[PDB]
Design a protein around this nucleic acid. Structure first.
Ligand SMILES: [Mg+2]
Ligand SMILES: [Mg+2]
Ligand SMILES: [Mg+2]
Ligand SMILES: [Mg+2]
Ligand SMILES: [Mg+2]
Ligand SMILES: [Mg+2]
Ligand SMILES: [Mg+2]
Ligand SMILES: [Mg+2]
Ligand SMILES: [Mg+2]
Ligand SMILES: [Mg+2]
Ligand SMILES: [Mg+2]
Ligand SMILES: [Mg+2]
Ligand SMILES: [Mg+2]
Ligand SMILES: [Mg+2]
Ligand SMILES: [Mg+2]
Ligand SMILES: [Mg+2]
Ligand SMILES: [Mg+2]
Ligand SMILES: [Mg+2]
Ligand SMILES: [Mg+2]
Ligand SMILES: [Mg+2]
Ligand SMILES: [Mg+2]
Lengths: 259, 156, 207, 74, 60
RNA sequence: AUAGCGUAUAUUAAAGUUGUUGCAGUUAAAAAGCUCGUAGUUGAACUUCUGUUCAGGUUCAUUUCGAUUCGUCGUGUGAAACUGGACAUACGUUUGCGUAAACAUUUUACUGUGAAAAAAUUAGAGUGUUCCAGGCAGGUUUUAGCCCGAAUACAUUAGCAUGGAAUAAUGGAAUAGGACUAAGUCCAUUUUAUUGGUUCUUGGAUUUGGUAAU
RNA sequence: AACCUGGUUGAUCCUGCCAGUUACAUAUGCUUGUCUUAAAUAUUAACCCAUGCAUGUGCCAGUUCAGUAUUGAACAGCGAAACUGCGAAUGGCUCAUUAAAACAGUUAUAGUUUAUUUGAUAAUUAAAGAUUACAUGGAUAACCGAGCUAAUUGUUGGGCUAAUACAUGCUUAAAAUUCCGUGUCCUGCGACCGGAACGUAUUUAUUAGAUAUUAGACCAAUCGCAGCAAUGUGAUUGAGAUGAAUCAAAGUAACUGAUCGGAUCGAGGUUUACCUCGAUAAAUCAUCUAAGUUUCUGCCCUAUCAGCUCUCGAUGGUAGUGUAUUGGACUACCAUGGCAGUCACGGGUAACGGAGAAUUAGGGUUCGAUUCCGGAGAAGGAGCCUGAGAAACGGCUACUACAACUACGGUUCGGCAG
């Protein structure tokens, strides 16, 4: 197809952005970055659609080219309109001192979770690879594309580190075993939150894990979509308010409209 | 010990000439084997054979990745290669019944197996070895077929 | 304009297989480098000739047109030296390759003993080029540096083939590089089994 | 402050508010200029650029600043 | 021109173009509800029909 | 019929005039002159039946009742088909804390779940675009705000995961060392920081006694 | 809305079609007043095209002695030209080709490539030569000047000066490890002493890649370590990843020098010899992005297609070669295979495949050139340049068939399926 694709059409932009069908032809193609294209929430959508701080395209440009440095991701400045803010990222707006975390709700759209200052220092990281590096230095790699050196050696692959973004120092970690708390990054089970019942390894391809929530409904999903939220029943994150429990539309209609 | 070909045949990643081994006038003595970790037992013969097969999953660099097959061996006619046969019932929605279809997969046989025509083969997916062959033989199950191998239809 | 596409062949059944797209530049193959020994060629001024090749991804690949010297290893001894390659003796692929003196992987070549002869002499105090008066050891006994030269020599016994060859000063070695890619003839010296074999092959060709 | 307002609102709006001016006919000119420019070299090219019909970004920020200098706080 | 606005059909036309009983009922409707133009009654028919398909599927 | 309405042509229902559901074939068009027969399609009956006890719901009935109310709830009592315990020669061992594994259960078709799944479509919730087509918005003077939405279903085949007893195919001990067990013989063999002998384990083969309703 | 009616007879019950009825696409005829939307040279001719336009781009952060402005006496605001970057491979158009092909859903890449992004690394600037590091060297465009043509985004000579352009090169770890010395002591090729080599990468060869999801004892030698010393003393954490590696990360040889190891830029300043923010170039590994190949299964009509494939590849095996990589992709040798009534092979399609569309009691029937995703092509074939990506076509070369100028000798930024 003669090389790389530089455009994205509105119809094809992920449902998670909640763009208007009728709003145009194109949408903003997420930039190459920490997160994949489909797991991206770009900045331009973050500002224009979600916060409404930008009313149109020009506006976004204004915010991100203003010498004043308005927007922050994991502590580091970003001027790129299509920067792929992904899952677990902490995005902070210097002028208002708003600190949000990027998440999926149970319905699988992108949400900004308002965080107080103590939350906003911390960010959750999930182990992708673990290796010996050059010079015989152990290293570890993360979903947000971090490379962390000299990890605590007990840290296994597919764990969750709690990362201090002020100190760039991993604080506490927990791994994928029975009894820990998860959030589910991708699935039809996207956004649900729960205690791991157990894990079955099929060893040819795809390992499936099962989950429960506070209410006691089971889930299953492939290992890749599990993200660990801490030890115990306690999560190290403030969840958008479903608390991670899915609601039957019956439950929804009942509680909302009193049926 | 058998060398018949234009080129001398030895496994890769195994050095035959080490100072201890030159003291023995006998071919080889240190052999390469492997584990292909799908829970597949590495055969007795892979271990004790003299065979050079660069396409053997046990004796070589062959990586078995992602797809596994059960089948019938219809033809062991060619050099270190068989054909396998998978029979299935394709469902025709309208007439609301099935239809008997078959597929022939060329598989690669490592010399470590004894393969009678009309046996039962397990094969793992493989990198493209030849024009036809994407599959390599893992496990042979012996069995007796009466009459020609073709007519015999097993859906398992 | 050479092509590696599989589309230009018959599918398994024998059926003529259809074509919509063109030749694509990414299925490109490239002309062959017949890589030559300039060593014995008298008419040649330029003995070493290597071509950079701009490749997919902006990298380089290195074409050996003309080669004379290469880098060879002696396996038992773990000793690797660069020497001049003399002749291409046997080729399993095709014999017109031997006639054209072409270098390819698993070609069979001969090597100047000389660097290996010297390393051996240095290390074990034994000159392999000589028939009689084989031992070069120093005059002071009980001197750690001569003692070592004996202690080395104590365990060692060579193949008659390696010895005889060393005397001859030419050595049979099969070459392990891809000169049409790397731009090198790098190789290993034949020992034991492979030597029995390629000697016999050379021998029944010679018979 | 009307500083910000003067720095943020786009130009067609500053015309609605009478601050800026008319956007004159761009396209035709610009494309005939493109024509001639492509078809010669540097000296002549500069001589053509002197004649471009554009309302320059310079002139824009100039009228903006000047209007910011003619302003009186309520 | 690409456009993503949706298609509509508000009414339907009878298998049988002329049948007295039906025509008469339709003119009794046009009369009492002060309509013009038979399709008005047809689109009402359409609407009702939608409702009924719904109830039916739900009774499955 | 109506701001629309004729006509031509392809195609859809009409068509049970293409028929799996679902057609016809003595005489309306239609059984091949007749047998043998390979592919194909199709295939008789039998195997943990059954009974007894416990619990959980889910239904039912109503000369049991109740409470309140514009019909649900609680409760009876019995009666069902379950679902799951339990003992009965009876859907398994063995181990670590109702759930895993390993062992053992011949394979599959079939069926129930689940994962993986592209939006727009379609079905459909919410919402008065003046209705509506439709859009994904909206609603509120508590206003340097507030409230709420952008659901859900469907997503056929084949791959994947897992629960399955019927039905259907296929299997297993008929030249049996088949099964269990004991005692030998070989070939390998992880651990015991290392090579050697003995061993040990283990995991294959093999010889012979014993056990069994063979 | 799960409905049927007209026509064979003198009449009758049948079969059966014709006809009516219905929806929906194009077409068309007549007729047309508001408002809200709105398809649109697919079908025939992937036929041919005048003209205009559809691909350009500058920050404070690579080059300014243009110009402007009476500017920090090296420039400093604004801002051409022209080098140097980057893009031009997306987008838009069309459906001619195409029937396991493309496509769809499912896989593999342990068989690969990826410019721009995000994260992390980096002590050695090979040898010979050269060597200033308070920083190396030679050129050229714009410009000035002279020309050639009837002709174009043609270019020829001549005089100038920059670059992040084109060349070149300086930058003091320790330890350990390997080798060498006719060195000391010795007897362990062991210790001390002395001398080399020693980044990364490239190319081969060899040594080990550690395994605590796991079991031990009898002889010998145990190698070590407390310890000269007989005596022992055991041995138990120290090294990741996978289902699997010949993986990661390492040791020892050499090999290449065609890898990289900053002679570049801003800004704000503590009054200025020092701080604090940044821009950019580039290597490796991840990461994003996309691609190449790839597993399994699934297409319409046709037997007035029953056998097909294999003289140079048909199926497999070997060495090679080639490629980004896998492979008969290609070569040499070898074997005689591979597919087919479960329809091979071969025709046809007024056939691009899907997402979907019209009808629909149920089951079906019939369409999908056309918004989205794949695929293909740019008049027809082939071949290339350059790139991270191209067989590009709003790039070049050639032919076949054509388009535009011509002073006839030449020329075209000639290619509407934008
Ligand atoms: Mg961008
Ligand atoms: Mg995998
Ligand atoms: Mg590169
Ligand atoms: Mg403007
Ligand atoms: Mg008759
Ligand atoms: Mg039966
Ligand atoms: Mg029991
Ligand atoms: Mg008659
Ligand atoms: Mg009559
Ligand atoms: Mg009709
Ligand atoms: Mg009006
Ligand atoms: Mg410029
Ligand atoms: Mg065909
Ligand atoms: Mg296929
Ligand atoms: Mg000059
Ligand atoms: Mg020293
Ligand atoms: Mg300064
Ligand atoms: Mg079609
Ligand atoms: Mg398209
Ligand atoms: Mg694809
Ligand atoms: Mg046009």
């Amino acid at each position: 197809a003669r090389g790389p694709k530089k455009h994205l059409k509105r119809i094809n932009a992920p449902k998670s952005w909640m763009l208007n069908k009728l709003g145009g032809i194109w949408a903003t193609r997420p930039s190459q970055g920490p997160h994949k294209l489909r797991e991206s929430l770009p900045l331009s959508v973050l500002l224009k659609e979600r916060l409404n701080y930008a009313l149109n395209g020009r506006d976004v440009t204004l915010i991100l080219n203003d010498k004043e440095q308005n927007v922050f991701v994991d502590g580091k400045v970003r001027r790129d309109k299509g920067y792929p803010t992904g899952l677990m990222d902490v995005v902070r707006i210097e002028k208002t001192d708003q600190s949000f975390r990027i998440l999926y709700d149970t319905k699988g759209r992108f949400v900004l979770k308002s965080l107080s200052k103590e939350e906003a220092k911390y960010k959750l990281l999930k182990v992708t690879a673990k290796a010996i590096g050059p010079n015989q230095i152990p290293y570890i790699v993360t979903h947000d594309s971090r490379t962390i050196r000299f990890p605590n050696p007990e840290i296994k692959i597919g764990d969750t580190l709690k990362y201090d973004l002020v100190n760039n120092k991993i604080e506490n970690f927990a791994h994928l075993e029975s009894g820990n708390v998860c959030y589910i990054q991708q699935g039809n089970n996207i956004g649900r939150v729960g205690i791991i019942q157990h894990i079955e390894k099929h060893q040819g391809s795809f390992d499936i894990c099962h989950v429960k929530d506070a209410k006691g409904n089971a889930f299953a999903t492939r290992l890749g979509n599990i993200f660990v939220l801490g030890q115990g029943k306690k999560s190290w994150i403030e969840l958008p308010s479903g608390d991670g429990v899915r609601e039957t539309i019956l439950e929804e209609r009942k509680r909302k409209f009193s049926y | 010990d058998t060398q018949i070909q234009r080129a001398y045949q030895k496994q890769d990643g195994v050095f035959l000439n080490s100072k201890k081994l030159l003291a023995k006038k006998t071919s080889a003595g240190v052999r390469y084997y492997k584990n292909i970790g799908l829970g597949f037992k590495t055969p007795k013969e892979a271990i004790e054979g003299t065979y050079v097969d660069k396409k053997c999953p046990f004796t070589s660099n062959l990586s078995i990745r992602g797809k596994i097959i059960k089948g019938l061996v219809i033809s062991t006619k060619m050099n270190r290669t068989v054909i396998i046969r998978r029979d299935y019932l394709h469902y025709v929605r309208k007439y609301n019944r099935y239809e008997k279809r078959h597929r022939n997969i060329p598989v690669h046989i490592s010399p470590c197996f004894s393969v009678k025509e009309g046996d039962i083969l397990v094969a793992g997916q493989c990198r493209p070895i030849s024009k036809t062959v994407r599959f390599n033989a893992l496990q042979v199950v012996p069995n007796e077929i009466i009459g020609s191998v073709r007519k015999q239809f097993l859906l398992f | 304009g050479i092509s590696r596409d599989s589309k230009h062949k018959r599918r398994a059944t024998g059926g003529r297989m259809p074509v919509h797209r063109k030749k694509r530049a990414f299925e490109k193959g490239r002309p062959i480098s017949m890589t030559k020994l300039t060593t014995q060629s008298t008419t040649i001024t330029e003995k070493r000739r290597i071509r950079p090749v701009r490749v997919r991804g902006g990298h380089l690949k290195f074409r050996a047109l003309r080669l004379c010297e290469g880098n060879f290893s002696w396996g038992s001894e773990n000793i690797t030296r660069k020497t001049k390659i003399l002749d291409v003796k046997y080729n399993a692929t095709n014999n017109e390759l031997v006639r054209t003196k072409t270098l390819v992987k698993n070609s069979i070549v001969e090597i100047d003993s000389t660097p290996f002869r010297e390393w051996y002499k240095l290390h074990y105090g034994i000159d392999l080029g000589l028939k009689k008066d084989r031992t070069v050891l120093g005059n002071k006994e009980k001197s750690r540096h001569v003692q070592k030269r004996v202690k080395r020599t104590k365990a060692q016994a060579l193949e008659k083939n390696i010895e005889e060859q060393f005397v001859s000063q030419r050595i049979l070695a099969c070459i392990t590089s891809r000169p049409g890619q790397s731009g090198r003839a790098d190789g290993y010296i034949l020992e034991g089994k492979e030597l029995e074999f390629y000697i016999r092959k050379l021998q029944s060709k010679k018979k | 402050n009307q500083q910000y307002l003067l720095k943020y609102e786009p130009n067609y709006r500053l015309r609605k508010v009478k601050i800026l001016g008319e956007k004159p006919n761009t396209r035709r000119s610009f494309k005939e200029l493109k024509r001639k420019i492509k078809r010669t070299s540097g000296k002549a090219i500069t001589k053509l650029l002197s004649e471009k019909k554009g309302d320059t970004w310079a002139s824009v920020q100039s009228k903006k600043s000047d209007h910011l200098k003619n302003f009186v706080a309520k | 021109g690409k456009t993503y606005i949706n298609t509509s059909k508000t009414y339907s036309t009878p298998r049988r173009p002329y049948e007295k009983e039906r025509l008469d009922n339709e003119m009794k409707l046009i009369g009492t509800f002060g309509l013009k133009n038979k399709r008005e009654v047809w689109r009402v028919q359409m609407i009702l029909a939608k409702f009924r398909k719904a109830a039916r599927e739900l009774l499955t």
